[PDB]
Design a protein around this ligand. Structure first.
Ligand SMILES: *[C@@H]1O[C@H](CO[C@@H]2O[C@@H](C)[C@@H](O)[C@@H](O)[C@@H]2O)[C@@H](O[C@@H]2O[C@H](CO)[C@@H](O[C@@H]3O[C@H](CO[C@H]4O[C@H](CO)[C@@H](O)[C@H](O)[C@@H]4O[C@@H]4O[C@H](CO)[C@@H](O[C@@H]5O[C@H](CO)[C@H](O)[C@H](O)[C@H]5O)[C@H](O)[C@H]4NC(C)=O)[C@@H](O)[C@H](O[C@H]4O[C@H](CO)[C@@H](O)[C@H](O)[C@@H]4O[C@@H]4O[C@H](CO)[C@@H](O)[C@H](O)[C@H]4NC(C)=O)[C@@H]3O)[C@H](O)[C@H]2NC(C)=O)[C@H](O)[C@H]1NC(C)=O
Ligand SMILES: *[C@@H]1O[C@H](CO[C@@H]2O[C@@H](C)[C@@H](O)[C@@H](O)[C@@H]2O)[C@@H](O[C@@H]2O[C@H](CO)[C@@H](O[C@@H]3O[C@H](CO[C@H]4O[C@H](CO)[C@@H](O)[C@H](O)[C@@H]4O[C@@H]4O[C@H](CO)[C@@H](O[C@@H]5O[C@H](CO)[C@H](O)[C@H](O)[C@H]5O)[C@H](O)[C@H]4NC(C)=O)[C@@H](O)[C@H](O[C@H]4O[C@H](CO)[C@@H](O)[C@H](O)[C@@H]4O[C@@H]4O[C@H](CO)[C@@H](O)[C@H](O)[C@H]4NC(C)=O)[C@@H]3O)[C@H](O)[C@H]2NC(C)=O)[C@H](O)[C@H]1NC(C)=O
Lengths: 209, 209
């Protein structure tokens, strides 16, 4: 009956020692008749108990969305440990077990390059600065924008795309007021990946050279 | 279980350059031995055309047939978003299979180019890769190439146009040269052909600086 989905820790969260990474176990199609879900967490086959039990969410299709969240400790997710979730419920003949771990294989650093505003864009009220992040592995990556030491949160980063070479590429687009770009303000592009030095790289772009 | 039709578009280079002749191809597969009669009808925006060359049937390795019809386009016709139909008729199918293609409708957007040099892992091996990121273009119809000192470099690979949240398209292109050629100081160019561009062309260069 119910379906189980196991989600990895937010890429930013696994890369900064100053964050709360957590694996997430989601159970959709839980009956209004048998709502209880017992969760069992395993870490490299060893049962852990620290999991956080989250209150069920009534979905509009008259079913519940039960979730459990196990916090990971950085040095474990990046070090390829296997996080197993065992979902037990009355409406299941036998428990559902799901497993997640970071993608194995040679870590490859991303390469960044920037795109200043377009020929048409520069005639509009708002302009867009873009970032191209190519050839990183695994797809676990954080793309943020910041200007003058302050977070610039009006951007859209595309989801990682696989290449014929076996690595990923994405595109980030920050949209800002034309007036700000013309004033020669300097906007940067932050990329976080396990293969970068100090897990981070940044690429600035302005009206100036 | 019957015959199958696939309708192919003219190459982006043929459509926006005085290079070769642009054609729209209609490929029919699974043509049975007992039902060989394949009738091809062509419609440019509703208007049936007879300037259609059908390549005599080809005996496939799995013992089927591959019948292909070719229609030549009057260059500007594809770019002007003219719709092409292929009504394939066969005895083996209950009713004719009609497939319709045209250049993607909606206002065009210019590609933005970005060059990336070799990475840390690349400059260790005998060969180095030089990437080229292209984004923001619409329609997907694009032609990416490489050339150095004027001669085309043909050991490259380009990803298919990926779709952005903002309905624009993007791709990355990777050229694999010899470390010695990059190291020598030689300059490599990324040639991007698209209708939204001025003179349907833009280049982007990189060298060892
Ligand atoms: C009743 O309705 C519910 C809900 O309705 C839904 O929502 C409403 C609003 C409508 O839009 C409606 O149409 C929707 O249906 C139904 O529930 C849905 O059920 C389906 C399956 O039946 C689920 O589909 C899977 O989605 C996965 C991705 O889910 C994410 O993205 C969607 C869409 O963006 C979101 O809605 C989800 O919430 C998920 O988002 C993630 O959520 C996490 C937890 O909140 C986040 O993680 C945490 O984030 C926090 C911060 O908030 C911290 O930072 C933590 O550290 C961090 O862990 C996470 O960030 C967030 N991400 C995003 C992007 O937002 C898919 O991956 C999955 O794919 C598989 O599906 C098929 C399974 O066989 C199949 O197609 C494939 O196999 C496919 O691929 C698998 O997965 C991976 C792929 O990489 C690979 O391993 C394999 O290829 C393959 N493996 C396996 C073993 O399968 C599904 O498509 C859907 O998520 C779910 N919705 C919700 C809300 O949970 C319900 O089904 C309906 N009932 C009935 C009877 O049908
Ligand atoms: C028995 O054999 C036959 C023959 O097969 C061949 O021989 C056997 C022995 C094997 O070796 C086999 O590998 C060989 O292919 C079998 O027939 C095959 O059947 C499958 C389907 O079952 C066909 O698959 C589709 O292919 C499309 C792409 O085809 C190109 O690529 C293949 C390689 O994979 C080539 O072999 C083809 O020749 C095609 O190549 C293109 O050909 C054009 C015409 O020649 C070229 O254009 C012209 O070029 C000249 C220069 O030469 C000029 O420049 C002109 O200007 C120019 O027009 C073009 O260059 C060339 N391109 C390339 C890339 O090479 C796929 O597109 C298609 O996928 C779509 O459809 C799927 C469903 O079928 C769908 O799931 C996908 O998502 C996808 O997209 C969707 O499609 C649907 C419609 O189908 C749409 O509604 C959707 O909108 C659409 N979505 C999107 C987002 O677009 C298929 O994968 C296969 O091609 C065919 N073989 C051949 C040779 O045609 C038969 O199956 C066997 N029997 C059995 C029992 O299996």
């Amino acid at each position: 009956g119910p379906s189980v989905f196991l989600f990895p820790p937010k890429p930013k969260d696994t890369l900064m020692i100053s964050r709360t990474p957590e694996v997430t176990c989601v159970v959709v199609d839980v009956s209004h008749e048998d709502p209880e879900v017992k969760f069992n967490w395993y870490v490299d086959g060893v049962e852990v108990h620290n999991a956080k039990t989250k209150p069920r969410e009534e979905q509009y299709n008259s079913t519940y969305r039960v979730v459990s969240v196990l916090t990971v400790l950085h040095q474990d997710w990046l070090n390829g440990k296997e996080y197993k979730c065992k979902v037990s419920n009355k409406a299941l003949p036998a428990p559902i077990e799901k497993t997640i771990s970071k993608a194995k294989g040679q870590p490859r650093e991303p390469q960044v390059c920037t795109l200043p505003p377009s020929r048409d864009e520069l005639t509009k009220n708002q302009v867009s600065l873009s970032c191209a992040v190519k050839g990183f592995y695994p797809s676990d990556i954080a793309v943020e924008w910041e200007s003058n030491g302050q977070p610039e949160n009006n951007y859209k980063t595309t989801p990682p795309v696989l290449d014929s070479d076996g690595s990923f590429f994405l595109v980030s687009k920050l949209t800002v007021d034309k007036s700000r770009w013309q004033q020669g303000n300097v906007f940067s592009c932050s990329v976080m990946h396990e293969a970068l030095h100090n897990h981070y790289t940044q690429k600035s772009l302005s009206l100036s050279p």
